[PDB]
Design a protein around this motif. Structure first.
Motif, PDB file in Angstrom:
ATOM      1  N   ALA A   1       2.044 -11.054   1.027  1.00 55.21           N
ATOM      2  CA  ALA A   1       1.398 -10.405   2.165  1.00 55.21           C
ATOM      3  C   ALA A   1       2.107 -10.863   3.436  1.00 55.21           C
ATOM      4  N   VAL A   2       1.935 -10.128   4.533  1.00 53.38           N
ATOM      5  CA  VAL A   2       2.747 -10.365   5.724  1.00 53.38           C
ATOM      6  C   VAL A   2       1.930 -10.797   6.939  1.00 53.38           C
ATOM      7  N   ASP A   3       0.656 -11.110   6.732  1.00 54.70           N
ATOM      8  CA  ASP A   3      -0.176 -11.649   7.804  1.00 54.70           C
ATOM      9  C   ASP A   3       0.068 -13.151   7.952  1.00 54.70           C
ATOM     10  N   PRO A   4       0.724 -13.574   9.045  1.00 53.70           N
ATOM     11  CA  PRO A   4       1.059 -15.002   9.133  1.00 53.70           C
ATOM     12  C   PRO A   4      -0.160 -15.906   9.262  1.00 53.70           C
TER      13      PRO A   4
ATOM     14  N   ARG B   1       5.393   6.407   1.328  1.00 49.46           N
ATOM     15  CA  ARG B   1       6.242   5.225   1.342  1.00 49.46           C
ATOM     16  C   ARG B   1       5.388   3.982   1.120  1.00 49.46           C
ATOM     17  N   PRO B   2       5.914   3.000   0.374  1.00 46.87           N
ATOM     18  CA  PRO B   2       5.190   1.728   0.294  1.00 46.87           C
ATOM     19  C   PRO B   2       5.238   1.004   1.632  1.00 46.87           C
ATOM     20  N   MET B   3       4.114   0.446   2.068  1.00 51.40           N
ATOM     21  CA  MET B   3       4.057  -0.256   3.346  1.00 51.40           C
ATOM     22  C   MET B   3       3.243  -1.541   3.258  1.00 51.40           C
ATOM     23  N   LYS B   4       3.568  -2.484   4.136  1.00 47.22           N
ATOM     24  CA  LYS B   4       2.815  -3.721   4.264  1.00 47.22           C
ATOM     25  C   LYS B   4       2.509  -3.979   5.731  1.00 47.22           C
ATOM     26  N   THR B   5       1.266  -4.344   6.014  1.00 46.88           N
ATOM     27  CA  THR B   5       0.860  -4.753   7.351  1.00 46.88           C
ATOM     28  C   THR B   5      -0.052  -5.955   7.219  1.00 46.88           C
TER      29      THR B   5
ATOM     30  N   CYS C   1       8.957  -9.839  10.156  1.00 46.89           N
ATOM     31  CA  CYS C   1       9.898 -10.463   9.236  1.00 46.89           C
ATOM     32  C   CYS C   1       9.527 -10.176   7.787  1.00 46.89           C
ATOM     33  N   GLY C   2       8.244 -10.320   7.471  1.00 48.79           N
ATOM     34  CA  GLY C   2       7.755 -10.052   6.131  1.00 48.79           C
ATOM     35  C   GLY C   2       7.897  -8.586   5.769  1.00 48.79           C
ATOM     36  N   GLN C   3       7.616  -7.718   6.736  1.00 51.46           N
ATOM     37  CA  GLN C   3       7.737  -6.280   6.539  1.00 51.46           C
ATOM     38  C   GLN C   3       9.161  -5.873   6.202  1.00 51.46           C
ATOM     39  N   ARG C   4      10.120  -6.397   6.957  1.00 49.31           N
ATOM     40  CA  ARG C   4      11.510  -6.016   6.763  1.00 49.31           C
ATOM     41  C   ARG C   4      12.055  -6.573   5.453  1.00 49.31           C
ATOM     42  N   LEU C   5      11.627  -7.779   5.091  1.00 49.31           N
ATOM     43  CA  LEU C   5      12.034  -8.373   3.823  1.00 49.31           C
ATOM     44  C   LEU C   5      11.672  -7.440   2.665  1.00 49.31           C
ATOM     45  N   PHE C   6      10.430  -6.971   2.674  1.00 47.89           N
ATOM     46  CA  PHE C   6       9.929  -6.054   1.657  1.00 47.89           C
ATOM     47  C   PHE C   6      10.808  -4.805   1.559  1.00 47.89           C
ATOM     48  N   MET C   7      11.149  -4.235   2.710  1.00 50.70           N
ATOM     49  CA  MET C   7      11.964  -3.024   2.756  1.00 50.70           C
ATOM     50  C   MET C   7      13.384  -3.250   2.260  1.00 50.70           C
ATOM     51  N   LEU C   8      13.860  -4.489   2.359  1.00 54.19           N
ATOM     52  CA  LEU C   8      15.232  -4.810   1.985  1.00 54.19           C
ATOM     53  C   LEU C   8      15.319  -5.456   0.605  1.00 54.19           C
ATOM     54  N   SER C   9      14.205  -5.468  -0.121  1.00 57.73           N
ATOM     55  CA  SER C   9      14.136  -6.187  -1.388  1.00 57.73           C
ATOM     56  C   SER C   9      14.902  -5.463  -2.494  1.00 57.73           C
ATOM     57  N   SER C  10      14.195  -4.693  -3.312  1.00 59.84           N
ATOM     58  CA  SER C  10      14.839  -3.956  -4.389  1.00 59.84           C
ATOM     59  C   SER C  10      14.042  -2.708  -4.717  1.00 59.84           C
ATOM     60  N   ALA C  11      14.702  -1.740  -5.344  1.00 64.20           N
ATOM     61  CA  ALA C  11      14.082  -0.457  -5.631  1.00 64.20           C
ATOM     62  C   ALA C  11      14.715   0.213  -6.844  1.00 64.20           C
ATOM     63  N   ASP C  12      13.866   0.774  -7.694  1.00 64.87           N
ATOM     64  CA  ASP C  12      14.308   1.576  -8.820  1.00 64.87           C
ATOM     65  C   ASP C  12      14.379   3.031  -8.361  1.00 64.87           C
ATOM     66  N   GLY C  13      14.824   3.921  -9.239  1.00 64.59           N
ATOM     67  CA  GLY C  13      15.123   5.283  -8.840  1.00 64.59           C
ATOM     68  C   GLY C  13      16.568   5.339  -8.388  1.00 64.59           C
ATOM     69  N   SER C  14      17.034   6.520  -7.997  1.00 68.51           N
ATOM     70  CA  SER C  14      18.457   6.729  -7.747  1.00 68.51           C
ATOM     71  C   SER C  14      18.828   6.821  -6.266  1.00 68.51           C
ATOM     72  N   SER C  15      17.831   6.908  -5.389  1.00 67.65           N
ATOM     73  CA  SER C  15      18.082   7.273  -3.993  1.00 67.65           C
ATOM     74  C   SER C  15      17.893   6.146  -2.971  1.00 67.65           C
ATOM     75  N   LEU C  16      17.168   5.095  -3.336  1.00 68.87           N
ATOM     76  CA  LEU C  16      16.795   4.066  -2.364  1.00 68.87           C
ATOM     77  C   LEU C  16      17.801   2.917  -2.264  1.00 68.87           C
TER      78      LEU C  16
ATOM     79  N   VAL D   1       0.842  -1.191   0.000  1.00 69.45           N
ATOM     80  CA  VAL D   1       0.000   0.000   0.000  1.00 69.45           C
ATOM     81  C   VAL D   1       0.877   1.241   0.000  1.00 69.45           C
ATOM     82  N   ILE D   2       0.434   2.279  -0.704  1.00 63.00           N
ATOM     83  CA  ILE D   2       1.152   3.544  -0.715  1.00 63.00           C
ATOM     84  C   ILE D   2       0.630   4.385   0.445  1.00 63.00           C
ATOM     85  N   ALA D   3       1.442   4.481   1.488  1.00 64.44           N
ATOM     86  CA  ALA D   3       1.038   5.140   2.718  1.00 64.44           C
ATOM     87  C   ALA D   3       1.522   6.579   2.747  1.00 64.44           C
ATOM     88  N   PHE D   4       0.635   7.493   3.126  1.00 70.79           N
ATOM     89  CA  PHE D   4       1.028   8.870   3.400  1.00 70.79           C
ATOM     90  C   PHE D   4       1.722   8.931   4.754  1.00 70.79           C
TER      91      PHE D   4
END
Length: 500
Positions: free
Chosen positions: A444-447, A312-316, A374-389, A98-101
């Motif tokens: 998704a990250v809901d176990p 920021r993209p987020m998962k819950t 664990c699922g949340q952090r995996l997502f954040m550590l995955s991959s990203a396009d653009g020049s800054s991430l 989800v794109i979170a404000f």
């Protein structure tokens, strides 16, 4: 039986090979890639592999006659936020994304704000026939409560007339009259249904109930000033065929030319969308941007119609019904991409000695975490396009969570704590365990919704890795210990077994 089992297992496990399959595709009837989904054969070209998962971008592609969205005068939201005209890219559906404000640091996240319509200074597009005129933006939801949802509709119907369909749409090399049979001159997509006020209100996308732009105005002349935003949106007239995230991407593909454009303004094409697995709602997003955290980004509310919000993209766990879908979703994603659910009671591995499995090498680990964490952090550590991430991501697309003393198939899974292991290796097999759960960066990250994999992927563990039983013994893979020839004994079968 035999070598076909290894081939069958590899074919199944291919769906977890994210860098290889999360590709940047464009629709192209001269394409080398093809796939028959149901009665329809899709043709596409793969421009690039390893599209960013956390944030995915590719160069805006416009194969229409006019190619307005590739024009230098065309405004694309990513030009401002990312520094280049990018469309949201990534062939696999991204479950839970989800794109979170947020605030600039990421705190105070709002994960439902996106449902509000955008304020891109577009509506009203024209007021030539009206008593009075107004600038684009006047009819739109206030900037102070701007979301990411695309405008509910535009004009009475799309294609609004014969010329639009025959000049703008049918000539578009990404358009197809069969795939897009719900938006043609013979079968138009209706916003204001005049065939049944002299009409009935619907929408090009969504199921209704959202804050949108005032398409009507106060007067009896529909679309004319003044306006009273927000207007509560209605739903599509017929949403029954949108049965999954891929079908939702088709809605985006086919409705590009339904939107207005003029020189210097936002050009809308290949829009990403949010699909709700629980309700079947397909909501188009007006912006390709997925992350914005620069010093110039606006925090949660602003009146500045020229600024862009921090997001920021987020998962819950609670977002596990939601799916971030790009316009270019691959029609074979069920067999080429990870499923929505995590995998309960298994561990990521690679093949060992042909028919066994060994765990992959953890590149990093997080202690005392939850499965959701664990699922949340995996997502954040995955991959990203653009020049800054690049400073955030690590290339991790698979994770194994190990509960300290909970069976992750049970009710305790929700609150269980333990150790998370992160991998950059493409998995080839799975190992059963009572206390583990397997995540991908697209999961998704809901176990609590976790499922079993197909058993073809699950192999017995090779517990005989780095075990040399010598010339008088062989390692039993069921126990990981040496079984000695007669008259021999010891852990490595090199001592003579003596008899009393």
């Amino acid at each position: 039986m035999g070598s076909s089992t290894s081939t069958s297992r590899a074919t199944y496990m291919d769906r977890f090979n994210i860098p290889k399959n999360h590709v940047d595709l464009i629709w192209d009837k001269d394409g080398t890639k093809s796939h028959t989904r149901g009665n329809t054969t899709y043709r596409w070209t793969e421009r690039k592999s390893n599209v960013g998962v956390y944030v995915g971008y590719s160069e805006m592609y416009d194969s229409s006659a006019q190619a307005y969205c590739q024009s230098s005068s065309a405004k694309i939201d990513t030009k401002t936020t990312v520094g280049a005209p990018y469309m949201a890219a990534g062939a696999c559906p991204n479950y839970g994304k989800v794109i979170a404000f947020t605030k600039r640091d990421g705190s105070r996240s709002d994960m439902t704000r996106w449902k509000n319509e955008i304020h891109a200074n577009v509506m009203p597009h024209s007021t030539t026939s009206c008593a009075s005129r107004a600038d684009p933006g006047a009819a739109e939801v206030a900037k102070s409560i701007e979301g990411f949802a695309m405008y509910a509709g535009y004009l009475t119907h799309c294609p609004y007339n014969v010329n639009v369909y025959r000049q703008d749409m049918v000539t578009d090399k990404e358009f197809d009259s069969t795939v897009c049979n719900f938006v043609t001159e013979s079968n138009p997509l209706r916003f204001l249904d005049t065939t049944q006020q002299p009409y009935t209100e619907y929408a090009f996308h969504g199921k209704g109930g959202h804050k949108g732009y005032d398409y009507k105005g106060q007067t009896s002349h529909v679309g004319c000033p003044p306006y009273n935003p927000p207007h509560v949106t209605k739903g599509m007239k017929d949403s029954s065929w949108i049965t999954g995230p891929f079908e939702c991407s088709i809605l985006s593909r086919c409705t590009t030319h339904c939107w207005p454009y003029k020189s210097g303004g936002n050009c809308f094409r290949s829009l990403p969308a949010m699909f709700d697995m629980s309700t079947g709602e397909c909501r188009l997003l007006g912006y390709h941007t997925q992350d914005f955290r620069s010093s110039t980004c606006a925090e949660l509310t602003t009146d500045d119609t020229n600024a862009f919000y921090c997001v920021r993209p987020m998962k819950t766990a609670a977002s596990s019904n939601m799916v971030y879908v790009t316009s270019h979703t691959r029609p074979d994603h069920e067999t080429k991409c990870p499923p929505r659910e995590p995998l309960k009671n298994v561990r990521w591995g690679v093949v060992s000695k042909g028919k066994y499995c060994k765990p992959m090498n953890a590149r990093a680990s997080l202690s005392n975490a939850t499965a959701e964490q664990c699922g949340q952090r995996l997502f954040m550590l995955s991959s990203a396009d653009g020049s800054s991430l690049s400073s955030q991501v690590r290339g991790y697309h698979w994770a194994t969570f190990v509960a300290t003393d909970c069976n992750m198939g049970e009710s305790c899974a929700a609150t269980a704590r333990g150790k998370c292991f992160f991998y950059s290796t493409v998995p080839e097999c799975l190992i059963h365990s009572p206390t583990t759960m397997a995540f991908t960066s697209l999961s998704a990250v809901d176990p609590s919704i976790a499922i079993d994999p197909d058993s073809i992927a699950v192999l017995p563990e090779d517990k005989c890795v780095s075990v040399d039983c010598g010339a008088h013994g062989t390692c039993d893979v069921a126990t990981g210990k040496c079984v000695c020839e007669p008259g021999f004994t010891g852990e490595r079968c090199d001592a003579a077994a003596l008899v009393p």
